[PDB]
Symmetry: C4
């Protein structure tokens, strides 16, 4: 288990890489 | 719970995405 | 122990830096 | 506590933002 803020940052991180990849594809 | 280092990096990761969006718009 | 979604985001974050370094060079 | 893979990704995430700022400034 993890802190809700860490879970929130994990969702944000995944979206970050997706947008970063799409911004180049 | 999460380690303090993980909580700190979570805040930093959120900041990182916010900065990337603002810098992309 | 960490939430599985946090472990997934950790793997994705590590990949993110690898790709980021490769794309800048 | 947090998984070592999460701790590693936290260190790497912090380093990632540092490099992003330096390259931005
Ligand atoms: N990039 C991340 C660092 C830390 C571990 C994992 C989830 C959160 C917090 C964002 C990847
Ligand atoms: Cl955790």
């Amino acid at each position: 288990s993890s802190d809700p803020l860490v879970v929130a940052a994990s969702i944000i991180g995944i979206l970050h890489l997706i947008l970063w990849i799409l911004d180049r594809l």
